[PDB]
Amino acid sequence: MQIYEGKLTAEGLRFGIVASRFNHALVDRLVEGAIDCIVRHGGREEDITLVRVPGSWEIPVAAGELARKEDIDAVIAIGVLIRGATPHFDYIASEVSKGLANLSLELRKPITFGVITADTLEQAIERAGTKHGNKGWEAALSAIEMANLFKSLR
Amino acid sequence: MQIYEGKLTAEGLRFGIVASRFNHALVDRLVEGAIDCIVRHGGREEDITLVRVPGSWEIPVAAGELARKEDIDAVIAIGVLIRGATPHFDYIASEVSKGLANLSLELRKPITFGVITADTLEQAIERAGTKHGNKGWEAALSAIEMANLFKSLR
Amino acid sequence: MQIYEGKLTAEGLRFGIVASRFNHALVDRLVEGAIDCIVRHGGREEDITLVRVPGSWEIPVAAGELARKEDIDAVIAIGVLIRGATPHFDYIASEVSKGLANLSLELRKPITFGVITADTLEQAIERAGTKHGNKGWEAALSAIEMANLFKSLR
Amino acid sequence: MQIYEGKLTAEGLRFGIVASRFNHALVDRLVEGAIDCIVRHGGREEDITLVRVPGSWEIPVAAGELARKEDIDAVIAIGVLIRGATPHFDYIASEVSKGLANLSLELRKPITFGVITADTLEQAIERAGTKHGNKGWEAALSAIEMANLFKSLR
Amino acid sequence: MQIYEGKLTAEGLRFGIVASRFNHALVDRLVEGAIDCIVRHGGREEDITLVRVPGSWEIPVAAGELARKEDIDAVIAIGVLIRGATPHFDYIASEVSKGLANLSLELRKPITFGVITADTLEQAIERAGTKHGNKGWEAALSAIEMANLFKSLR
Amino acid sequence: MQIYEGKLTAEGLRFGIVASRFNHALVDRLVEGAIDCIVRHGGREEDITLVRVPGSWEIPVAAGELARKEDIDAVIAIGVLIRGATPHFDYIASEVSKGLANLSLELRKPITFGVITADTLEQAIERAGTKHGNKGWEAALSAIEMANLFKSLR
Amino acid sequence: MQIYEGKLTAEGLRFGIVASRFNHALVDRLVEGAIDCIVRHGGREEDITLVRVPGSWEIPVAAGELARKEDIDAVIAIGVLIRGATPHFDYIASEVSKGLANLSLELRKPITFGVITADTLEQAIERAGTKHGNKGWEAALSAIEMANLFKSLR
Ligand SMILES: O=c1[nH]c(NC[C@H](O)[C@H](O)[C@H](O)CO)c(CCCCCP(=O)(O)O)c(=O)[nH]1
Ligand SMILES: O=c1[nH]c(NC[C@H](O)[C@H](O)[C@H](O)CO)c(CCCCCP(=O)(O)O)c(=O)[nH]1
Ligand SMILES: O=c1[nH]c(NC[C@H](O)[C@H](O)[C@H](O)CO)c(CCCCCP(=O)(O)O)c(=O)[nH]1
Ligand SMILES: O=c1[nH]c(NC[C@H](O)[C@H](O)[C@H](O)CO)c(CCCCCP(=O)(O)O)c(=O)[nH]1
Ligand SMILES: O=c1[nH]c(NC[C@H](O)[C@H](O)[C@H](O)CO)c(CCCCCP(=O)(O)O)c(=O)[nH]1
Ligand SMILES: O=c1[nH]c(NC[C@H](O)[C@H](O)[C@H](O)CO)c(CCCCCP(=O)(O)O)c(=O)[nH]1
Ligand SMILES: O=c1[nH]c(NC[C@H](O)[C@H](O)[C@H](O)CO)c(CCCCCP(=O)(O)O)c(=O)[nH]1
């Protein structure tokens, strides 16, 4: 059987992070986690490119530019959506996830999902460096694995 | 670390606004907010191109034409959807959001979302220049930031 | 500020109407409304091309052919979906709306939405020339505006 | 006014049917209905190409191959989805309907929807040759009409 | 009609920020927002003077010193009050707001209110960079506008 | 950015404490806390001036005299108000807090708030050296910080 | 400030794993996770020493022997305790945790805790490679970090 997998040492890997500003008190923790995951897995912080955008809505178009860079091995999308009184959350969450996934397939490059899509503030806090971990760390770790995998698969 | 971000001074930026007429008593307030945001951030009103369409349904096709203009730095989509008795709201809201996001990725240009998708009239009024702010102002401000960001990112 | 808008006089405009036969007792009223709107706004009935198809499912593929005609300025999609006992309604309504919107963006031509998506028969009757107006008339009026707009925007 | 429509005599028409095997005790009735509809409307059974696949999930990829045949005038998609305990039904139903609709627009050829998407076994039986008719017959009849229409429209 | 208003570009403006330490985990987010608002609107971080004090109670006396500086164009008061079991919250909230407003009128200089006065922890988190935005950003933006306005009004 | 802050070593600082006698069994604990805080932070007890007055009502007029002393760096107001059966508590609490805050702004000198304003006896005990700490210690610590801050700010 | 931390690359590190057999269907998944974590972080599987014991009760005495090996950098304790009808769970859980912690302090070597202590079977399954992750992976990852840290700290 042929087996392909990615290891988790990030030496020489170069990452793009696209992080929105809406709910920044939480997003900022996700960004801390993603960078820490990269660095302590052997990646250099100098090999990270961070792009900030207003909201989750704007993440895909920026990610599309980062993912097209030949010297970016994977992109990590970071944002925090918390449902309000209207259906607005649904439409933004739907479009951010679809855009990112579509870009990954079109550009044949990993784009990992570190966007929290929570019903409540409490759920968002839980997933941004408290009791349920840090979604930025998770998405960074995934990006490390996928970039490594792609060294032999792509 | 490389860091890219957009500032919020709008000097020299050129914007497209696509605004629907359904629910115009509210849309009109969103349009006032978007223009004011642009102007008081240093953008010239002369550098704004405003396109009117019948409903949110028609916003994407018009935005597609504006976004293709080489001298438009970003497009701001403005509309007001308020749920009625049928599922019709769902299908229009889904298509307007998908079209705009798809156009942004295909044309590699920011298109911001200033379309209210409310369950009730009250929710719509709240978001059109009353207690929950002005969604047109928010989407304009996002467009200013994204246009600036794109000056170095794109 | 540059301002683009469509007027509502239909002189010289040429329209495609795609109308399904499922629920024809109601669709037929929508078709009457769309034609009347066009004619009494100055459009010639001879400049209308009417295409009939079995159900809403089939509307997109036919509209795709009409919208590709160089001598059609806009297409008006007309149909009546009424929810039954199963989720079938959801999947047809989703695909008809997505197809029409996608075609409009791909062909860069207005395609307006005059498809009723009702939960009940009563809701459908209300929107087909009774208490809530005539969705065909509404979609025709939108098509007139968009075709006019596109004379300067496209 | 120019009027295009398809008649229902199937003489000389050639059809592709893609039929899944999941829930075959019902699918098989849909297949009987579709063939009967074609034959008794004047089509030759020899002009029917039947493709079998495992489940509704696999219907689109096979239909995509049939629809690309120059000597197939329309494709009829036949399957039976019945909701179980999980959301799995939703994702398969969503993808089968979207794939078929997308293929029809991309290949500019009619692909009709004879896939039952039922909440219960009873609903499925009702629509597979019992009290609510036969969805295969319905989709075949639609295909006849669309193929005829396309002789002048396409 | 004579019309006076402030624009939102902060070039050359100099701001005083007085920030308390009680509830610092939240205040610190407010401070981040206020600085970011200033900087990305064109203000220089070097033109910001930040004064820290123990609690909201102490904000006025420090703001009084900052507002008296000839080279400070506006002061931004930042703090977080969260109601406890006693009426203590009421008396501190009343005195901080009255002191700041009184100082502004006496010194004829803008002092903006970025003090959260919440009944619950949750409300405070909402307003400190999560779902209800960032009160520091809001008060900074107000200070930019008022300083600009005062260039012609004062 | 210019940053001003006060450290917490109290060497050379001179404090005024104004302490009321109503509820003295609790006030006395607040006074013990304030003195201890000052001394163990390096302040000399000889540099403390303690003024006693009958009730919280009388605290402001005495504090006004202490705050005017050139050799007093900050004043600490200490008292215990516990609500009784009438609104009397409200009027005394309102006037003590307003007087102290007003004096601080008028004399441009820190006056910290160590007056408990409790609804119940239990709440008062909690805040006077039991489970919720010692409000005198808190107000003393604030005074240390403010006096230090004022060495560079004033 | 001096800062010590461990990175997460496991190159050259040597680990002891002590895994009990009670509830092995779950323990076995924890063991898979711990090994995978080690290997894909750069550790060699050959550098892992696995010791099996009957139950969680016996884990400490075996870990005590592994931790005393000069060529073991850290020990990972793996087990699954699920509460039954009696207090027995409490006493075993108390002694396993105390023994491991005591051994770590006495031998001045990291011993990480990958023992599930669940009230229900469901909770145990959740934490053994399903919805709440894999406690073996978590404890392995901790051991990598601690072993690295101890290269400079110990
Ligand atoms: O990342 C985000 N963004 C966001 N809205 C802003 C949006 O992403 C765009 O920036 C904006 O629409 C302009 O394009 C929000 C708010 C979504 C919830 C709206 C609450 P409501 O339904 O009560 O109006 C979020 O939680 N996370
Ligand atoms: O921007 C819009 N548009 C709109 N409908 C018009 C639509 O966008 C098109 O213009 C029309 O369908 C013609 O294409 C509506 C109404 C949607 C709710 C319908 C109520 P109902 O479900 O009770 O029929 C809106 O709220 N905001
Ligand atoms: O325009 C339409 N079409 C339609 N079904 C036919 C469909 O559009 C296709 O023609 C058919 O599937 C063949 O392709 C229907 C019926 C949809 C509701 C089905 C009820 P059920 O869920 O009880 O089975 C409609 O209301 N409006
Ligand atoms: O045509 C189909 N297919 C199908 N599942 C099989 C699927 O289509 C694929 O063949 C399979 O997933 C392999 O690709 C099913 C079962 C769907 C409902 C699943 C029940 P559950 O949610 O209880 O698991 C169906 O009803 N009709
Ligand atoms: O900015 C602040 N300050 C503050 N108290 C400290 C106060 O501002 C002074 O620093 C102190 O009184 C010394 O002067 C608090 C606590 C207020 C609520 C008290 C709870 P309680 O009523 O249960 O005692 C706050 O939330 N935010
Ligand atoms: O510091 C104080 N002072 C005080 N009352 C005395 C007041 O401050 C003056 O000393 C007095 O009014 C004379 O000027 C009180 C009592 C206030 C509550 C009154 C209870 P009642 O409403 O039941 O009459 C206190 O709790 N703490
Ligand atoms: O790792 C373990 N071990 C274990 N019991 C065995 C024990 O660890 C020793 O091996 C045994 O006592 C012999 O020393 C158990 C069972 C504990 C719950 C007992 C159920 P009861 O209270 O219903 O009797 C476990 O869940 N996980």
PDB file of N, CA and C in Angstrom, chain D residues 26 29-30 80 82 116 118 120-134:
ATOM      1  N   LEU D  26     -37.962   0.493  -4.695  1.00  0.00           N
ATOM      2  CA  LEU D  26     -38.709   1.666  -5.130  1.00  0.00           C
ATOM      3  C   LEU D  26     -38.138   2.242  -6.404  1.00  0.00           C
ATOM      4  N   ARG D  29     -39.427   0.767  -9.577  1.00  0.00           N
ATOM      5  CA  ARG D  29     -40.745   1.186 -10.026  1.00  0.00           C
ATOM      6  C   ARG D  29     -40.624   2.502 -10.790  1.00  0.00           C
ATOM      7  N   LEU D  30     -39.727   3.380 -10.335  1.00  0.00           N
ATOM      8  CA  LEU D  30     -39.490   4.642 -11.022  1.00  0.00           C
ATOM      9  C   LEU D  30     -38.923   4.373 -12.405  1.00  0.00           C
ATOM     10  N   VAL D  80     -33.894   7.217  -5.053  1.00  0.00           N
ATOM     11  CA  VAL D  80     -34.777   7.311  -3.904  1.00  0.00           C
ATOM     12  C   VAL D  80     -33.980   7.535  -2.645  1.00  0.00           C
ATOM     13  N   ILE D  82     -34.313   8.391   1.342  1.00  0.00           N
ATOM     14  CA  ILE D  82     -35.239   8.393   2.474  1.00  0.00           C
ATOM     15  C   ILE D  82     -34.447   8.756   3.726  1.00  0.00           C
ATOM     16  N   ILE D 116     -36.549  10.953  -5.642  1.00  0.00           N
ATOM     17  CA  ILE D 116     -37.442  11.183  -4.518  1.00  0.00           C
ATOM     18  C   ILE D 116     -36.562  11.565  -3.324  1.00  0.00           C
ATOM     19  N   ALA D 118     -37.526  11.906   0.305  1.00  0.00           N
ATOM     20  CA  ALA D 118     -38.581  11.729   1.280  1.00  0.00           C
ATOM     21  C   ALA D 118     -38.125  11.669   2.708  1.00  0.00           C
ATOM     22  N   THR D 120     -39.978   9.943   4.925  1.00  0.00           N
ATOM     23  CA  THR D 120     -40.384   8.622   5.419  1.00  0.00           C
ATOM     24  C   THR D 120     -40.517   7.627   4.293  1.00  0.00           C
ATOM     25  N   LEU D 121     -40.500   6.354   4.662  1.00  0.00           N
ATOM     26  CA  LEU D 121     -40.654   5.261   3.732  1.00  0.00           C
ATOM     27  C   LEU D 121     -41.994   5.401   3.049  1.00  0.00           C
ATOM     28  N   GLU D 122     -43.002   5.760   3.832  1.00  0.00           N
ATOM     29  CA  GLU D 122     -44.328   5.868   3.296  1.00  0.00           C
ATOM     30  C   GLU D 122     -44.389   6.911   2.168  1.00  0.00           C
ATOM     31  N   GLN D 123     -43.795   8.075   2.401  1.00  0.00           N
ATOM     32  CA  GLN D 123     -43.746   9.101   1.387  1.00  0.00           C
ATOM     33  C   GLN D 123     -43.070   8.584   0.129  1.00  0.00           C
ATOM     34  N   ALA D 124     -42.027   7.784   0.299  1.00  0.00           N
ATOM     35  CA  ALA D 124     -41.323   7.282  -0.856  1.00  0.00           C
ATOM     36  C   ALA D 124     -42.209   6.324  -1.642  1.00  0.00           C
ATOM     37  N   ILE D 125     -42.971   5.472  -0.951  1.00  0.00           N
ATOM     38  CA  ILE D 125     -43.835   4.481  -1.635  1.00  0.00           C
ATOM     39  C   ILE D 125     -44.928   5.220  -2.398  1.00  0.00           C
ATOM     40  N   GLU D 126     -45.455   6.267  -1.761  1.00  0.00           N
ATOM     41  CA  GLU D 126     -46.512   7.071  -2.345  1.00  0.00           C
ATOM     42  C   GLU D 126     -46.108   7.608  -3.692  1.00  0.00           C
ATOM     43  N   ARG D 127     -44.833   7.989  -3.814  1.00  0.00           N
ATOM     44  CA  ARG D 127     -44.328   8.640  -5.022  1.00  0.00           C
ATOM     45  C   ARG D 127     -43.665   7.699  -6.017  1.00  0.00           C
ATOM     46  N   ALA D 128     -43.688   6.405  -5.715  1.00  0.00           N
ATOM     47  CA  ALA D 128     -43.053   5.428  -6.587  1.00  0.00           C
ATOM     48  C   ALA D 128     -44.068   4.448  -7.175  1.00  0.00           C
ATOM     49  N   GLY D 129     -45.103   5.004  -7.794  1.00  0.00           N
ATOM     50  CA  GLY D 129     -46.127   4.199  -8.400  1.00  0.00           C
ATOM     51  C   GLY D 129     -47.327   3.875  -7.553  1.00  0.00           C
ATOM     52  N   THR D 130     -47.547   4.619  -6.465  1.00  0.00           N
ATOM     53  CA  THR D 130     -48.800   4.478  -5.720  1.00  0.00           C
ATOM     54  C   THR D 130     -49.570   5.791  -5.689  1.00  0.00           C
ATOM     55  N   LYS D 131     -49.987   6.255  -4.509  1.00  0.00           N
ATOM     56  CA  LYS D 131     -51.068   7.241  -4.489  1.00  0.00           C
ATOM     57  C   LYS D 131     -50.706   8.624  -4.959  1.00  0.00           C
ATOM     58  N   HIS D 132     -49.428   8.911  -4.974  1.00  0.00           N
ATOM     59  CA  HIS D 132     -49.011  10.194  -5.443  1.00  0.00           C
ATOM     60  C   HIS D 132     -48.320  10.040  -6.787  1.00  0.00           C
ATOM     61  N   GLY D 133     -48.587   8.951  -7.510  1.00  0.00           N
ATOM     62  CA  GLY D 133     -48.013   8.772  -8.833  1.00  0.00           C
ATOM     63  C   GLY D 133     -46.615   8.177  -8.829  1.00  0.00           C
ATOM     64  N   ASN D 134     -45.907   8.446  -9.915  1.00  0.00           N
ATOM     65  CA  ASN D 134     -44.605   7.849 -10.194  1.00  0.00           C
ATOM     66  C   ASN D 134     -43.614   8.910 -10.657  1.00  0.00           C
TER      67      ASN D 134
END
